[PDB]
From Swiss-Prot, chain A:
Present with 2610 molecules/cell in log phase SD medium. The lineage of its organism: Eukaryota, Fungi, Dikarya, Ascomycota, Saccharomycotina. It comes from Saccharomyces cerevisiae (strain ATCC 204508 / S288c) (Baker's yeast). It is found in: Nucleus. Component of the two forms of the RSC complex composed of at least either RSC1 or RSC2, and ARP7, ARP9, LDB7, NPL6, RSC3, RSC30, RSC4, RSC58, RSC6, RSC8, RSC9, SFH1, STH1, HTL1 and probably RTT102. The complexes interact with histone and histone variant components of centromeric chromatin. Belongs to the RSC9 family. This is Chromatin structure-remodeling complex subunit RSC9. Component of the chromatin structure-remodeling complex (RSC), which is involved in transcription regulation and nucleosome positioning. RSC is responsible for the transfer of a histone octamer from a nucleosome core particle to naked DNA. The reaction requires ATP and involves an activated RSC-nucleosome intermediate. Remodeling reaction also involves DNA translocation, DNA twist and conformational change.
UniProtKB/Swiss-Prot annotation, chain C:
The gene is RSC8. Present with 3380 molecules/cell in log phase SD medium. Component of the chromatin structure-remodeling complex (RSC), which is involved in transcription regulation and nucleosome positioning. RSC is responsible for the transfer of a histone octamer from a nucleosome core particle to naked DNA. The reaction requires ATP and involves an activated RSC-nucleosome intermediate. Remodeling reaction also involves DNA translocation, DNA twist and conformational change. Dimerizes via the C-terminal coiled coil. Interacts directly with HTL1, NPL6, RSC6 and the N-terminus of STH1. Component of the two forms of the RSC complex composed of at least either RSC1 or RSC2, and ARP7, ARP9, LDB7, NPL6, RSC3, RSC30, RSC4, RSC58, RSC6, RSC8, RSC9, SFH1, STH1, HTL1 and probably RTT102. The complexes interact with histone and histone variant components of centromeric chromatin. Residues 1-96 form the SWIRM domain. It is found in: Nucleus. The chain holds residues 82 to 202 of 557 of the full protein. This is Chromatin structure-remodeling complex protein RSC8.
Swiss-Prot record, chain E:
It is found in: Nucleus. Belongs to the SNF5 family. It comes from Saccharomyces cerevisiae (strain ATCC 204508 / S288c) (Baker's yeast). Residues 40-81 are annotated as: Interaction with STH1. Present with 3940 molecules/cell in log phase SD medium. This is Chromatin structure-remodeling complex subunit SFH1. The keyword Nucleotide-binding does not apply.
Curated annotation (Swiss-Prot), chain F:
It comes from Saccharomyces cerevisiae (strain ATCC 204508 / S288c). Signal peptide: none annotated. Component of the chromatin structure remodeling complex (RSC), which is involved in transcription regulation and nucleosome positioning. RSC is responsible for the transfer of a histone octamer from a nucleosome core particle to naked DNA. The reaction requires ATP and involves an activated RSC-nucleosome intermediate. Remodeling reaction also involves DNA translocation, DNA twist and conformational change. Belongs to the RSC7/SWP82 family. RSC7 subfamily. Present with 3510 molecules/cell in log phase SD medium. Interacts with ARP7, ARP9, RSC3, RSC8, RSC30 and STH1. Component of the two forms of the RSC complex composed of at least either RSC1 or RSC2, and ARP7, ARP9, LDB7, NPL6, RSC3, RSC30, RSC4, RSC58, RSC6, RSC8, RSC9, SFH1, STH1, HTL1 and probably RTT102. The complexes interact with histone and histone variant components of centromeric chromatin. Component of a fungal-specific module (HTL1-LDB7-NPL6-RSC3-RSC30) within the RSC complex. This is Chromatin structure-remodeling complex subunit RSC7. It is found in: Nucleus.
Amino acid sequence: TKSIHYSLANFNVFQSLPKETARGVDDLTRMEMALLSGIPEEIKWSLKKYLTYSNKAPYMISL
Amino acid sequence: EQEAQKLEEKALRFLAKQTHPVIIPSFASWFDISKIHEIEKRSNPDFFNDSSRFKTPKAYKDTRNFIINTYRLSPYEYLTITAVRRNVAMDVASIVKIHAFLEKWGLINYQIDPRTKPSLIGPSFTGHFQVVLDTP
Amino acid sequence: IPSFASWFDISKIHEIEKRSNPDFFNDSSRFKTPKAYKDTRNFIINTYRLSPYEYLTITAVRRNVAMDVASIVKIHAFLEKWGLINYQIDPRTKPSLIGPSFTGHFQVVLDTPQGLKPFLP
Amino acid sequence: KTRSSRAGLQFPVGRVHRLLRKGNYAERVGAGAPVYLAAVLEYLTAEILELAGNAARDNKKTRIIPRHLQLAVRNDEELNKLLGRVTIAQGGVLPNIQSVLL
Amino acid sequence: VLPDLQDQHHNPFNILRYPKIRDTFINGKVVSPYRLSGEAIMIPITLDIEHMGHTIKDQFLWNYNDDSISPEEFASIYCKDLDMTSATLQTQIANIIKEQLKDLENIAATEIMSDLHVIINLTCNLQDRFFEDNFQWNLNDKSLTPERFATSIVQDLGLTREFIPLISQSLHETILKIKKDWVDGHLIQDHVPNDAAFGGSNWCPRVEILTKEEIQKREIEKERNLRRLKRETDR
Amino acid sequence: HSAACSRFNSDLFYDRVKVLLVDQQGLRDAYTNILHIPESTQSTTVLGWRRSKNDTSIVYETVIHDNDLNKPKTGLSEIPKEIYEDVVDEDVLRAITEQQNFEKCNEY
């Protein structure tokens, strides 16, 4: 279960120290960074979530 | 023949073995260790356009493929720029510039734990994959 | 032994090498002259002809040629681009910069906002 | 036409040659010995004067004093080994406190 | 010694079998990600700071012709990396790398336009296997940068990578010295180390060997030589 | 003499393999946990992927592609058509364009 030999995911230095926001880029920076990358099929998702945050929380992505 | 088997043996001999996964944020899928994408040319690094003789696309690849190779062999550790500057002979301004650029797209020092993201099957279905490499 | 570009000869100077580095024939510098360029080129060749199975490094020839390294490297990178000296080589002898192990055959995974995904083209 | 200008020195070659002659060090003295000795003397004097000037500039002084000469001869290990048995008047001793006394 | 070329199975736990991997695991640290033209001239910057119980010594070239980081942000990241962050240390760094710039900003390799040749005799030391070497270097040449010459030297010899940013910097400092006396009496006499008639028993002068035994006396010896050498020019 | 030149170019090779191939295949980085290996041995310039048909398993393997092993890599990629095409006999000119097209075709 919780053992070093079972898996090396908490040895002695990271089992409660990592911040609560250490799971990747935030949902806003992810939108902003996936918007200037040239890959299609990805802009069609960024411009979908920006389109959502313009009708459910516009005060968050204000110019 | 026998030299082909000796070549395959010596190749697998001096070859890095993957022991830890590497994670890209899926908005920076575009790159390899041989091509420079347009985003890398229009971004802050301006080694191109021969503005000087000390910085050149050859030194750009010689440094980017050093940073990515140093990170992807030990992803558990964090890439400190003092070690990079201690290993590369480039000027400090460019070293920190390319390091912040690589960290911006989440190519190196990407803060991520795989215990909060479940697995999935991609649009590409199961198949038979190979990676062709130049002879060493 | 060159298999291509057989215009080279130790007797005279060809026009293909003049157009390569023109700074050797139009400059009146005391240290650089076509006579010394021909001398050092014939020295690089006569010193490689002793064992055509090793990689001729720049510092090796630099050990005993009285010429600026800025031009030594210039003419040395010229005698490797053609069928010249570095054309018959063994695997072990190489400049072979000491870098980190190569990457690119590793399995990279993507982080889609819907879950992890394998990176397959 | 003085020989110091011919040799390219600032020390008197004639005076050195006269001192070598009347010093009864030998019965004959060549022509290269005076210029050689003057060269060694001027080299040593130039080195010591340069070190003393550096020491005086470090002490924001524009006039060399025996203290500066002592500091310059004791800082450089070579001159310290050369002039180890020679004391200098009004030169004092260099500040050096032991670790066990601090 | 390191699990890079060795073969480990699917389970990463095997890496624990090496000591130099568990070392960075038993007493590691958790850190937060930091949040950040024209003709380029290179200016090396040396600094030997002795502030805390430990002292730091390193060199690096700045190229102040561009502005993307300031002498304060560089110290802000150089001390965060070393984890000895202190306001007095950041100010100490910004108080030393700025005087080096202001003192060396006045000298640039531009408008030289003089075919100059010099016997560059440099000495490098990385507190292990230090070396010295002397060769023929021609000023007024832009094809061979000192970084490429350093890469050639580290490639031909069996030297680690950390020697590339060591011989290049110490070489730039020499270049600045060669350009320093250029603002005055810097006439270039035909100074050769060897020849044949115009402008070789052995290459005893032309040496690039590495020596473990320290001849840690060159600092005074070079100053002794340099002081007399400077007076030799006047005559 | 020039004979001593190769005398230094030969043994300088033996010292390289001395410090890099008798230890654990290479030197530890000493700044990162990376085993520094001379780059002439691993690889360079990944040429892409090749996918074939297969119903659940997925296989990942590394293959090394090449066109001609006994025709060594050389320059002629940094040689434009202005310097050499002016006046040379067409025999070696054909050998030049042969080597060059091989140099370019080796990378797909």
